[PDB]
Amino acid sequence: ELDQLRQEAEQLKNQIRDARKACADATLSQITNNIDPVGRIQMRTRRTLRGHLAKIYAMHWGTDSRLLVSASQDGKLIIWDSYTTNKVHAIPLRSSWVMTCAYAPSGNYVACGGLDNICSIYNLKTREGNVRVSRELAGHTGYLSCCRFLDDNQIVTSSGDTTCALWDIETGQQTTTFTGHTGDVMSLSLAPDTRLFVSGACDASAKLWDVREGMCRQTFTGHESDINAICFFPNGNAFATGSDDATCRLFDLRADQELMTYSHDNIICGITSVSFSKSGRLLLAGYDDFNCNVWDALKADRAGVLAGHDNRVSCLGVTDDGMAVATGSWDSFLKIWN
Amino acid sequence: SIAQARKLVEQLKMEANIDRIKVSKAAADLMAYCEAHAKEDPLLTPVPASENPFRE
Amino acid sequence: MGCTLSAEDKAAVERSKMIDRNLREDGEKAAREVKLLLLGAGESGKSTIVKQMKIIHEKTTGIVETHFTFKDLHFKMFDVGGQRSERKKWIHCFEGVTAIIFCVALSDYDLVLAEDEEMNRMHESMKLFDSICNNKWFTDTSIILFLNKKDLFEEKIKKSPLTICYPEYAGSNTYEEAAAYIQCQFEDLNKRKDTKEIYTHFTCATDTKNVQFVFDAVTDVIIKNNLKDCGLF
Amino acid sequence: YFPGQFAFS
Amino acid sequence: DVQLVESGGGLVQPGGSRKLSCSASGFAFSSFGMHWVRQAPEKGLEWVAYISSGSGTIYYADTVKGRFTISRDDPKNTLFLQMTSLRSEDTAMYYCVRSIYYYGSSPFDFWGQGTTLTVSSSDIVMTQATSSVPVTPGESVSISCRSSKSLLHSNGNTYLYWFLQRPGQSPQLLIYRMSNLASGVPDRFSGSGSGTAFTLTISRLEAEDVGVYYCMQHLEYPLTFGAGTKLEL
Amino acid sequence: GVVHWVSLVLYCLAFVLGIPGNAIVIWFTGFKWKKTVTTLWFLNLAIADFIFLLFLPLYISYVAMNFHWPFGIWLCKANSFTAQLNMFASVFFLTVISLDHYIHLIHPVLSHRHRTLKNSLIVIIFIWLLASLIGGPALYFRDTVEFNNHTLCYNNFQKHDPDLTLIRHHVLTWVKFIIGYLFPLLTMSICYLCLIFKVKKRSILISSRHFWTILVVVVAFVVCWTPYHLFSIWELTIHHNSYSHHVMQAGIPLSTGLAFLNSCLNPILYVLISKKFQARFRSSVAEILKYT
Ligand SMILES: CC(C)CCC[C@@H](C)[C@H]1CC[C@H]2[C@@H]3CC=C4C[C@@H](O)CC[C@]4(C)[C@H]3CC[C@]12C
């Protein structure tokens, strides 16, 4: 019951690899060998948001594409109006070791978490005129790496204890727990239909789950180091992962294998964040060499650079309407590019 | 342990019974989606300065 | 953008200015504190280090914060011992602390290990010290090395020689020689002797000298950092 | 001699 | 439990002085700008004074400028209005209104209860032509408001507010910025219109809806109210 | 007679590269950089030196035309009030810079609880008020009288008093000397020497990079500011005796030029030479020039 099970697992792995090898006839680069390149992408910094006094660790965009939240190492969450660079809200945190933040799709709440293993839900629309701590979700045994809202009542979080959870905010109890990973889970991304999500962990693997069933659906490998970022394709049938070996990869849900690899010889630092444009043609990745890169998704050629930061680029996001790109850094400044 | 090995075997067997498609077909669908929405991406094709909210 | 604003936009700008002023005041208040990171070889100073300091405060839990004040100087100690995760993922969060307090129980040299075989707990302490001291994020941060339980070390050293831990050791079996050898071996793991100093101190006095030693080391670190700036402007 | 003749004073 | 309670009103001989106080309880008083608004007997509403958050901006109406002073005490949560040389046109009921200004806020959302002062014996003009209409329950009604200047700003905001005052009650905010429904307001009410022509529509009229409806502009100071349209039956 | 030309070229060189040097600091240390305690002294010093150099045209024109002042009467008082208000403010800020450097770099315990951005405002207001207070007599005693087909604008004392010449002349000159040269020179020298000698007593080594930045600042201060005060003291002899008066008319212009040169040197020896400025200026000018 020990060696036989291992042999059966090895046979299943060999069968899976053979099945996914038999389904590959031509590469995506071969298919896209005829389409015209996007050319050269030039972006300019239209706005710089100042006011933080430490390293910015996370950011998120509102669904109205105007308000954005940022989290800094000093115990602050700042909610900014991007058009006028006005600070709409400043929220002090009980614990200053914050690693992630999220914006509710309705704009009523914000989320926070970090080294305290707690996800704090803050209510913005209060009759008293202030911002309160609506809820405190506890139960993870490791630091909080990511959190994303499903609706005003549900939120999915990932932690460093190799598990992910789906919570009920009104009760504070863990509704579902996903536990299949081996290393710390670092990233999280919800599908546009919000029925399934993908997580990337330090064991160089990505897993596709099911929110309703609470069980693992698919597993993807190929990276040679920890996976720091993950993002869904706008269609919902693919995703992109950024890792610590200075390489991004595109995986397809239906093909069940890799499609393209985005890497360059003169790129050696790891990727901290990835994002897709509105159409999915451009892939934006933030690096540790202080500047971001814009890649042609369908051709795997670098299309542009975003170099305006003096330190590592930590957070990166694209608006719902795809008009601007907001990038944070380990200096105290956020930049909006157009 | 026996339980962990059994769980791993069951998980590996469940995910080995899904239905796959061809890589060429998936590439075609990705290209179709990218080309269909090519005219609604301000980042790919910049809009005139009159419609740009961040003018800045 | 001061004449084309509406009546409701000038009030929003004023609110933003007030928020920025409060942020500046709180950020200048938070820059006058001394932040110390307490790592230890499992934090062998479970009682003396975190109880001797007169702490005043201003589903397992994660980081633990302790505040105290000594001679009109505020100290915040951060302890991360219950964080059972990859260290290389959250250790860069502490880049910029004033000092790192490393606690080692030198009485735990005869004990081999727990839940393991054929190893020494002292060797694990040295491995952790080597990993932390030569970290890329801590190339400048200074280390205060506390050595605990010196009374038990003297009580036990008579029965068991120090050669059981260090095969190459050759000397007397008294307090001073063994302590000097252990201190030298611990301080010989510093491969970056420049711009980093180790402040060793046998802490088993169980008196008010621990906070005094921390205060002296912190003051020396701050003054060396100030003189490192080398800028009249 | 008037004081301040050649200075800005 | 948001509460604003006014006090200090009585009978004053002409040429005297009087102080009105407004005490707030149940909300963050320091974060709200505050207004004093008066209503003459059997007449409409009239804006009097405004003080910002942090007291950095103060505005008065030309009728009361020079003779009236407004102030706030934040630690005590109080708002003061000092009036000197009280004429015979200052006999009215005074309300203490709170308003907060940021992107997406709802100003003028809470009104006080009012205190009665009885003394012994260019600006944008808003027109509410219809003084009163007969209304049957269950029908649909429309109230029209007109302006002498275009309230549509260059930023895309139309600064028109609809308030309702029930008999023997304080005014309440129905609609802000011509389209947004205030919290606690039923879905029956709606607002629409274009520059210098706005409409407030009530569908399936029910009870406790009779009273006076006012349209106010917030494009630039001074803030001017309408004459008020009365719904009866 | 060459000394007149040397003075003229000295004023010209103080003019040409003096105002832009102050203006660069004023623009880039008070607008873009985040405000700190140590960046306010330098901003105020730059402002004082800029305003001091801006009102120089009148004086150099006066000296150029064989000491003739055609600019009425009131403009003498304004020029003299501006002169001995920015000079004293700059000197006092030079003293406070050394005070702050000594206290903050070697006495951390006194710092961290006193070096506050709000505490700098009080000192700034006090200095800017005291400088005007000492400059008040310049606004009051100045007057012109015509002689040798020229009108001389000078500190006038003959205002119908019997105890006129010696008492008030000595009082004004000695007060200016004591509050302008001895106190600031002594304070800066004491602070810098004490810092240097106390650094060695703890075995930390100061960098040779900023040791020169401390030595050259003091040497420039003394060479620039000693001759004007010496000539002010040695101008007090013509009351006692009928004197040469040709050494005065040549001597005072020269040290005036030196003192004006110091106000343009201060932007250079204090800031604009440090590695911090070089890095933060290149990294910004490269991006600004890219923008067009
Ligand atoms: C007669 C004239 C030339 C006297 C000098 C007046 C001017 C130059 C002085 C007087 C008061 C000064 C201000 C006093 C305090 C501060 C606060 C801080 O933000 C630094 C600059 C600032 C804002 C100063 C700028 C210069 C200032 C405005």
Short mmCIF file of N, CA, C and O in Angstrom, two decimals, chain A residues 3 17 22 32 35 39 80 99 129 159 161 203 207 227 237 260 263 266 284 290 302 310:
data_model
loop_
_atom_site.label_atom_id
_atom_site.label_comp_id
_atom_site.label_asym_id
_atom_site.label_seq_id
_atom_site.Cartn_x
_atom_site.Cartn_y
_atom_site.Cartn_z
N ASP A 3 4.54 1.25 -1.81
CA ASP A 3 5.25 1.30 -3.08
C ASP A 3 4.30 1.17 -4.26
O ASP A 3 4.52 1.79 -5.31
N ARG A 17 1.30 13.08 -18.99
CA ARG A 17 2.27 13.75 -19.85
C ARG A 17 2.15 13.26 -21.29
O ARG A 17 2.24 14.07 -22.23
N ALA A 22 0.37 14.29 -26.84
CA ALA A 22 -0.33 13.88 -28.05
C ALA A 22 -1.30 14.93 -28.57
O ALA A 22 -1.70 14.87 -29.74
N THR A 32 0.64 32.21 -34.99
CA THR A 32 0.68 33.66 -35.05
C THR A 32 1.85 34.19 -35.88
O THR A 32 2.22 35.36 -35.74
N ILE A 35 0.35 37.19 -38.36
CA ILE A 35 -0.27 38.43 -37.92
C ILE A 35 0.78 39.53 -37.79
O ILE A 35 1.97 39.26 -37.54
N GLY A 39 4.01 46.74 -33.18
CA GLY A 39 4.89 47.87 -33.39
C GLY A 39 5.63 48.26 -32.12
O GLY A 39 6.11 47.40 -31.38
N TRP A 80 -7.31 56.90 -3.27
CA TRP A 80 -7.04 58.06 -4.11
C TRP A 80 -8.09 58.19 -5.21
O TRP A 80 -8.57 57.19 -5.76
N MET A 99 0.61 43.16 3.38
CA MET A 99 1.12 42.55 2.16
C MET A 99 0.17 42.63 0.98
O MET A 99 0.61 42.46 -0.16
N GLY A 129 -19.65 58.99 9.19
CA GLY A 129 -18.71 59.80 8.45
C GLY A 129 -17.28 59.30 8.45
O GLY A 129 -16.44 59.89 7.76
N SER A 159 -2.79 32.17 1.69
CA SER A 159 -1.89 32.34 2.81
C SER A 159 -0.62 31.54 2.58
O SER A 159 -0.51 30.75 1.64
N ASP A 161 0.49 29.24 4.56
CA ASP A 161 0.36 27.89 5.10
C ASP A 161 -0.06 26.88 4.03
O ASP A 161 -0.67 25.86 4.37
N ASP A 203 6.13 26.12 -4.94
CA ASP A 203 6.57 24.85 -5.49
C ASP A 203 6.57 24.84 -7.02
O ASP A 203 6.57 23.75 -7.61
N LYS A 207 -2.42 25.98 -9.83
CA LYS A 207 -3.56 25.11 -9.67
C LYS A 207 -4.85 25.85 -9.99
O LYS A 207 -5.04 26.99 -9.57
N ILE A 227 6.52 31.12 -8.08
CA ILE A 227 5.61 31.91 -8.90
C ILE A 227 5.09 33.05 -8.05
O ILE A 227 4.43 32.83 -7.02
N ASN A 237 -10.14 31.66 -20.79
CA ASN A 237 -9.70 30.32 -21.15
C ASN A 237 -8.18 30.19 -21.13
O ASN A 237 -7.63 29.25 -21.70
N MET A 260 3.06 29.99 -24.60
CA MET A 260 4.24 30.79 -24.90
C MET A 260 5.06 31.02 -23.64
O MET A 260 4.55 30.96 -22.51
N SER A 263 10.69 35.56 -22.26
CA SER A 263 11.95 35.75 -21.55
C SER A 263 12.98 36.32 -22.51
O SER A 263 12.84 36.22 -23.73
N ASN A 266 19.02 39.22 -21.63
CA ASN A 266 19.46 40.32 -20.79
C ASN A 266 18.50 40.61 -19.64
O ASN A 266 18.60 41.68 -19.02
N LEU A 284 1.73 43.04 -19.52
CA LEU A 284 2.57 43.96 -18.76
C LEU A 284 3.12 43.26 -17.53
O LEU A 284 2.35 42.69 -16.74
N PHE A 290 13.68 47.65 -11.59
CA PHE A 290 13.09 48.97 -11.37
C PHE A 290 12.19 49.44 -12.51
O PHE A 290 11.62 50.53 -12.40
N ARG A 302 9.14 41.73 -27.04
CA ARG A 302 8.98 42.88 -26.17
C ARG A 302 8.58 44.10 -26.98
O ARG A 302 9.26 44.47 -27.95
N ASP A 310 12.54 54.49 -9.14
CA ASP A 310 13.88 54.39 -8.60
C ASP A 310 14.13 53.11 -7.82
O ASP A 310 15.28 52.84 -7.44
#
